[PDB]
Amino acid sequence: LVIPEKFQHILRVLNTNIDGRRKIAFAITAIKGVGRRYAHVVLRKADIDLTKRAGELTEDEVERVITIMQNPRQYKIPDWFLNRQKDVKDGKYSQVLANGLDNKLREDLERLKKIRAHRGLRHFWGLRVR
Amino acid sequence: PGVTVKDVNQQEFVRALAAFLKKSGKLKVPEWVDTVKLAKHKELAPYDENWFYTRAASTARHLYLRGGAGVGSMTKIYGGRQRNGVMPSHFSRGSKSVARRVLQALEGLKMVEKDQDGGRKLTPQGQRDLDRIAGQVAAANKKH
Amino acid sequence: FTYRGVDLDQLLDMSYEQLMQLYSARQRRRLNRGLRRKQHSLLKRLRKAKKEAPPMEKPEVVKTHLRDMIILPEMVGSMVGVYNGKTFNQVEIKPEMIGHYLGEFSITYKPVKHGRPGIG
Amino acid sequence: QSVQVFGRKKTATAVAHCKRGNGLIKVNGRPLEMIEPRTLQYKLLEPVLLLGKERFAGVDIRVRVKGGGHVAQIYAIRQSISKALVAYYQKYVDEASKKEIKDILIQYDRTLLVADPRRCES
Amino acid sequence: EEYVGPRLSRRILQQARQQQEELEAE
Amino acid sequence: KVPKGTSSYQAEWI
Amino acid sequence: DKLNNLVLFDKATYDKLCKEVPNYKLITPAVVSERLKIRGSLARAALQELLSKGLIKLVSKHRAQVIYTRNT
Amino acid sequence: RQRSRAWLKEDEPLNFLDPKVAQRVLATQPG
Amino acid sequence: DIKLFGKWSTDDVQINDISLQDYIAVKEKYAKYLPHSAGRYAAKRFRKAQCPIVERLTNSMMMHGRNNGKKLMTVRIVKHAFEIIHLLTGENPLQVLVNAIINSGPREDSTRIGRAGTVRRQAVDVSPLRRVNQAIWLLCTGAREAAFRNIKTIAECLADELINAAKGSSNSYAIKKKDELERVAKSNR
RNA sequence: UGUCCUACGCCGGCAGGCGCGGGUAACCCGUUGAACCCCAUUCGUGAUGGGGAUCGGGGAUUGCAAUUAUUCCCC
């Protein structure tokens, strides 16, 4: 290979630090709410070569893949893949991302607390659920 | 000019048959091939972006060596080691839709014929095409 | 309040064959299998109790042993006591308990608070 | 006007068919050079490299392979090849050449002619 | 060892018969 | 801090 | 301490691979990785580039090792 | 089934095309 | 002519000691194309002395638990390590192996003689066969231990250990252990 | 081993549904088409792409009953 002058060693995406020297799919896997399968599908829908690093890329690539990874359904990422398929409140198929995953998890725990079910009381004692 | 598919190297023939299938161009590709898995036991998406052509080449060869193969047996070919978690590993068959699509795709190109016996085999034109490609591989092998 | 983006009044008008597009998998499998005689008996009992009640007042409690029962959106506002093997627990049906079984509202066991161990 | 032998290892069995040919050796419908455990290729090519191409002048061998594993199959194949050559030199060639081949094969590796008696135990 | 055994020899004779038949085919 | 209709058998959890 | 190998090339690294590497008798990605702190992937890519250049003989290609020899 | 069981003997290598092949095919128990 | 891996000569190697000349079977009669022979060398006592030394190295490298069935992989490792030996030294790699083995085996060892409780070990001589066995096991264990968590491959550390043991430098784990046992025995006497 | 075991096709990302045949059995499953292992590709010594517990959402079977997840599949 060669030496890229426009190499970014550190990235800050969606309030998350990303190591640029690891490869791009596993680097965007390193954030909360995105795994390797989701990274590989969102990059294969972005028409980006998988062999490049997370610093050896152009910017318009990374904003385009960010726009795809927030909006999966408009980019033909289908309705079995997403984090939350039928949401309890609105029932919209939406993939949920770093901070929002924490907020939705705490929201579900709040819903269980309000409804006073056995699962919620088990979790609030700090025990095993499954 | 007497050469046989059985008497020539295998993985090089897979590569060459996939190259022929790709340069031929005429084949019906499913749309989901950039998001589909390949088995319930395999973990990630395949690294090869043209895995369709290689898999069609492989299933064409299996129909050449052993005719009368159905979808289920061809799924049983492509299965593997299921990592069950902390439970011990097992054997998991491959994806049924991928096998059904590659068999129907090669039936569309008049290389795979449905059998009165029940399964599928190769057409004679597909047999002579495969023999021509095998002769090409032999020519690129014994002279190199 | 909304449930899968559906308001409760539409849920009250939501038809029976098309609530099999709205619940989770287990609930839809149960309602596709259909409810047995005892669950409809509890349904009729709750409907009688809600109907024969003062409007400003909460309806009278209905005691039951049914814990396999799934909460339909018709029941919101009814006041149900459910057995846990030893004692009835009195619970109000809220809007947010449509996707839940009754039995997980009455816990059948007591939490473990460990005492000092004996000779082991 | 031909020879039909076998060679076994555990469960793997190879049946070798030796006849007047032109120096062509193929096994299970494919040549010996392209069989997948090529780290174990020199165990497959054993009588050829011990004897030379001259003793395979007008010899055509076709071997069916069935059963066993992979390594057991390779040992069954090489045993079948050696046994086929020995039986052909018994039946159609003189005695002295055959006993010469038996001497060199027993001197090199005992397994090439007699089978391993040990097999998986109940 | 002087004798093959039942099962292995059954497989061997079936294999030899099949090879003889396929050579008779061509 | 106990709700209206619950029993002690469930009040051990609250 | 932790090992921090450079993920891509440097000018000193490129000078060392273009000059100092093809007289090492043995050339393997592990050794060239360990002498001057290359990742194994980058070392394999550089060694494939040197094969394509023809400066370095290829001896043993295999899945787990590749072994190269300096030219003459 | 039980009567179809065939047992070989292995000595020179067995030639199935030899007319004396029957001498190296057993039908009953040795020993 | 018979060659190891199709290329390695076996008439050129020599055994330096007469003590191990009957126990390292590599020279003329026992040379073979591949180490993988699958022969019964554990059938009776002293039969494994006639087994070729390279097969002994292959067998003592697959010894450990996860690699406990894999011999094809191990003979691949040995092939690559011998290739690296020929690339580095240029000598016939079998002679390098033989020099490593004869230089690595301990010459005397300490033994509990007495009862359970008498911790005074007596220094006794070693069998030449036990010397060869211990040399093989220490070379394989040093190659195993040096390449556990590193970029260096098993075959690479194996070849490097064989070089240090044949050369006699104090970089091999095997020669360090040999010196340790030998000096402990010289302390006991 | 088998009257629930399945051959084949179609509909399915995937677990699964739908139409049809054989087998009360050296016949049909089944030439029992296993995994390690081999060949290449990527990874590169770090709690890492090792390891999978734990939880969060959906889907589908088994059954009178899966709520105190039966089981499996997908993020």
Description:
- This is part of a larger assembly, with nine protein chains of nine kinds.
- By secondary structure, chain A is mainly alpha-helical.
- Chain A folds into two domains: 78 residues, Helicase, Ruva Protein, domain 3, CATH 1.10.8; 52 residues, no CATH class.
- Chain A is built from five helices and two strands, in the order ββααααα.
- In chain A, strands 1-2 form a two-stranded antiparallel sheet.
- In chain A, a hairpin with a 4-residue loop joins strand 1 and strand 2.
- In chain A, helix 4 packs across helix 5.
- The N and C termini of chain A lie far apart (50 Å).
- Chain F is 29% helix and 0% strand.
- Chain I contains six helices and two strands; from the N terminus they run H-H-H-E-E-H-H-H.
- With 189 residues, chain I is mainly α.
- Helix content of chain I is 46%, strand content 5%.
- A two-stranded antiparallel sheet of chain I has the order 1-2.
- Chains G and I meet through helix 2 of G and helix 2 of I.
- Chain A binds one RNA strand of 75 nucleotides through helix 1, helix 2, helix 4 and helix 5.
* Total domains of chain I: 1
Q: Give the biggest sheet of chain E.
A: none
Shape designation of chain E: elongated
The fraction of residues assigned to DSSP E strands of chain I is: 5-15%
What oligomeric arrangement do these chains adopt? part of a larger assembly
What's the end-to-end separation of chain I, in Å? 49 Å
Individual helix count of chain E: 1
Rg of chain I (CA only): 17 Å
What structural class do the secondary elements of chain E suggest? mainly alpha
Order of helices and strands of chain E: H
Please state the structural category of chain I. mainly alpha
Kindly report the greatest chain-chain contact and the residue count on each side.
Answer: A-C, 17 and 16 residues
CATH superfamily of chain I: Ribosomal protein S7/S5
Protein name (chain C): Small ribosomal subunit protein uS19
Cross-link (Glycyl lysine isopeptide (Lys-Gly) (interchain with G-Cter in SUMO2)) (chain C): 94
GO molecular function, one term (chain C): structural constituent of ribosome
Family (chain C): Belongs to the universal ribosomal protein uS19 family.
Secondary structure: elements and pairs:
This is part of a larger assembly, with nine protein chains of nine kinds.
Chain B: H1 11-24, H2 51-65, H3 71-77, E1 80-82, E2 90-92, H4 96-108, E3 112-114, E4 120-122, H5 124-142
Antiparallel strand pairs in B: 1-2, 3-4
Helix pairs in contact in B: 1-2, 1-5, 2-4, 3-4
Chain C: H1 8-12, H2 25-33, H3 37-51, E1 62-64, E2 79-83, E3 88-92
Parallel strand pairs in C: 1-2
Antiparallel strand pairs in C: 2-3
Chain I: H1 53-61, H2 72-88, H3 93-104, E1 108-112, E2 121-125, H4 128-146, H5 154-167, H6 173-188
Antiparallel strand pairs in I: 1-2
Chain A binds one RNA strand of 75 nucleotides through helix 1, helix 2, helix 4 and helix 5.
